[PDB]
Paper text:
The proline-rich antimicrobial designer peptide Api137 inhibits protein expression in bacteria by binding simultaneously to the ribosomal polypeptide exit tunnel and the release factor (RF), depleting the cellular RF pool and leading to ribosomal arrest at stop codons. Separation of cellular extracts derived from cells exposed to Api137 in a sucrose gradient reveals elevated levels of partially assembled and not fully matured precursors of the 50S subunit (pre-50S). These data suggest a second mechanism for Api137, wherein it disrupts 50S subunit assembly by inducing the formation of misfolded precursor particles potentially incapable of evolving into active ribosomes, suggesting a bactericidal mechanism.
One state (d126_(L29)-/(L22)-) represents an early assembly precursor prior to the formation of the subunit’s core. To elucidate the underlying molecular defects leading to the accumulation of precursor particles, the most immature states from the Api137 data set (d126_(L29)-/(L22)- & C_(L22)-) and the control data set (C_L2) were compared. While the d126_(L29)-/(L22)- precursor exhibits structured domains I, II, and VI, it lacks cryo-EM density for domain III of the 23S rRNA. The absence of helix H34 was observed only in precursors that also lacked uL29 and bL23, indicating that these proteins are necessary for the proper formation of these critical regions in domains II and IV regions. In contrast, the absence of uL29 was observed only in the earliest precursor states, representing 5.1% of all precursors.
Numbering used by the authors:
A (entry chain N): 1 to 120
B (entry chain D): 1 to 126, 161 to 209
Write the structure that this text describes.
RNA sequence: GAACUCGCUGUGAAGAUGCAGUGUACCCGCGGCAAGCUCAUCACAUCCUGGGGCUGAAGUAGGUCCCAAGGGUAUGGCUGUUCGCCAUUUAAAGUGGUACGCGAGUAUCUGCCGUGGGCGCUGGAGAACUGAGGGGGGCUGCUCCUAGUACGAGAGGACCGGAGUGGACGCAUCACUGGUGUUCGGGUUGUCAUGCCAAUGGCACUGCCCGGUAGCUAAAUGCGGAAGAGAUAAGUGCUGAAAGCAUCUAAGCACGAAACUUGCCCCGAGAUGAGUUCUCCCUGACCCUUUAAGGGUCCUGAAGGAACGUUGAAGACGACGACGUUGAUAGGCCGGGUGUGAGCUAACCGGUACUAAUGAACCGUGAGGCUUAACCU
RNA sequence: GUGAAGAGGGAAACAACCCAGACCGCCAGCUAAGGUCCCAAAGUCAUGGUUAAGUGGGAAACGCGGAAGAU
RNA sequence: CCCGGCGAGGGGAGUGAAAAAGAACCUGAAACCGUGUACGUACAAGCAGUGGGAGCACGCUUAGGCGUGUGACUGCGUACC
């Protein structure tokens, strides 16, 4: 405990935290850029990078797993077709995070997460 | 007489020579270069402080670089003191390995423990403090494997050292 | 009512933070422990571990006295019970003070532990240590050549304490025994959803179960209570008068308890008595005054440190360690292994700059004050 | 007699013990009780001894012992 | 006129004797909260004051040792009803 542990706790319900991660990943991939707090931003990057890495291999099983973890027909349809070839040369680090100060409402740090290519 | 400083590679139950799985510690033996030797006149006592490992120059600042240049050896993980046997004196620059340690079978081991956070009173006393991460003085250990080719020192039982933590082994006199 | 709100001893319309004596403590904070059945502390006026005298002490085993608090000094059946009665152990389940000690067991405050900010150690910074001083513990059953041997009339029956073998406890690690390991995999009931089957996902405690990566765990084992040394009380004494003897003492002049210290280790130079070793750096100018460890202005911003960026087997916050484009510090990818069941693989290991770790900025100096002594001038 | 309704000085503080009744001020001296190795001020004074026990510096009655006490 | 948010508020100019009279509007002390001034304090124990007191800045008799502000320290000192 408190030593050699991967993934910040973010005290919440397990199913609730999984659903929030799925929704946040879907929103970010749809919008190509999101504004999220750094503690959640790091978890977002850690949980989203595996999906884009797996998107490189196009197969029925891979598409089924992507839909299972995403539950959005449009997101799966656009995946395996555009992000894959765009970052074919790149191996890892498909996204970047830049800090944007803090939220005035509740002094909450915020950060922009966006694809490294970001366009084209 | 002379001690060594290294790290805990691992701790597993290895088969004995007879063929029985016995707990044994895996301790690497790194060549500890002699950096400075104390004298009873200049400083009041005689003892040798040595260094182990090799750290990049970025971490070491230039005053420490000059100190090591005085020592005549490259900067390493740090400096560890060792009491001299009050007899023969070593030379600055040379390094030593397990070598003669296979002649006592009573060598002592010193080191830290698991990284454990400040625990609650109930779980630690059943009054808030820390357990572990303290120097350990377990003694009366017996050496098992003294293979110097692998630069690994193995002793009977377990070793007081966390994964990747520094530790020392000395030719104890107690039992 | 106001506080610049320490401990012990003595007095006290009687447990004194405010009285007399005595000891300790750099100033200011954060998180806990609640003293004002759990938790303990102290004296011996001693239950044992015991060692020494006497013994109606042949040896074990004992009876009485002298020393010893270093350590321990139970579990059950009756009371609310202290106490007390019965069963089984052990070395014992010891006697007393603390209002049989302990019922604040918005704590404002004092008291104890972990951890920080300011400053001092006299030019600054970096580490490495001597180290006074405080703390952890001196636990224990059995066997073996010694040994049915010396001593002892026979019988009885050693100094031995050298070796191994269990137990209560702390320290240490998950590799063997497994548990946990809702972040890994598989089976599956009801309902909803993907145009529909198959196939997938949410809710029903992770819907309910079968295993389990890394880490943590005791039910697992590794070390252990030294030996030795100094000093010892009682006791035991080699030789020996005053007092033609004796005598532990008057002369010469020793051994000696498990009781004290050291011997092993933790913290520790805030030890203000502020310690020692080494290394790197600062080697400008000008002005004024009440005339000196004086002040002020321009330039300089060195060594070193820290706030940010990646972070950790360090962490409540602080704080410590590593990396920071002169790169494996974190994330991801490949490979290997485990798990699950040809696939997924979180946390296990090697490689990879593919991404994040920048350029920069801030604090920090301009030779270090005075007095005495030895060295070349 | 004290306090009640007298301060002050000595005894470690101590309301009950001892000296001693403050008009005020003054950087003078002399004394009461009590002390003159200091803290804390004064002789480490002088004469002849007891005490060798830290009794002094806490302990009766009883026959030098009695003596064990304030963590 | 300007800052400010096209507000509130404030600052210049002017009126106004006076704006240290501005619509919270005569004069505006204390309790309570700040800044600067001069001094002390980070090895020192208790009704926090009393006499002594070197130093630290200023004006003075232009020193001649005077006071103002303070007290490192010293002996003493156990709130009121």
């Amino acid at each position: 405990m408190r030593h050699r542990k991967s993934g910040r706790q973010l005290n919440r319900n397990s199913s609730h935290r999984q659903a929030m991660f799925r929704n946040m990943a879907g929103s970010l991939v749809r919008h190509e850029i999101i504004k999220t707090t750094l503690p959640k931003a790091k978890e977002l990057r850690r949980v989203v990078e595996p999906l884009i890495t797996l998107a490189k291999t196009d197969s029925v099983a891979n598409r089924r797993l992507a839909f299972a973890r995403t539950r959005d027909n449009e997101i799966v349809a656009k995946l395996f077709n555009e992000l894959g070839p765009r970052f074919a040369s790149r191996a890892g680090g498909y996204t970047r995070i830049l800090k944007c100060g803090f939220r005035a409402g509740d002094n909450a740090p915020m950060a922009y997460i966006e694809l490294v290519d970001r366009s084209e | 007489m002379i001690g060594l400083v290294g790290k805990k590679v691992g701790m597993t139950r290895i088969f004995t020579e007879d063929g029985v799985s016995i707990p044994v510690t895996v301790i690497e033996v790194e060549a500890n270069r002699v950096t400075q030797v104390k004298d009873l006149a200049n400083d009041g006592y005689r003892a040798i402080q040595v260094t182990t490992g090799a750290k990049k120059a970025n971490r070491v600042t230039k005053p420490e670089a000059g100190h090591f240049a005085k020592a005549g050896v490259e900067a390493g993980r740090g400096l560890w003191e060792f009491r001299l046997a009050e007899g023969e004196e070593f030379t600055v620059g040379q390094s030593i390995s397990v070598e003669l340690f296979a002649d006592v079978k009573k060598v002592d081991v010193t080191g830290t423990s698991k990284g454990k956070g400040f625990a609650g009173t109930v779980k630690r006393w059943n009054m808030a403090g820390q357990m572990g991460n303290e120097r350990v003085t377990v003694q009366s250990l017996d050496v098992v494997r003294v293979d110097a080719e692998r630069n690994l020192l193995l002793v009977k039982g377990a070793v007081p050292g966390a994964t990747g933590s520094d530790l020392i082994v000395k030719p104890a006199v107690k039992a």
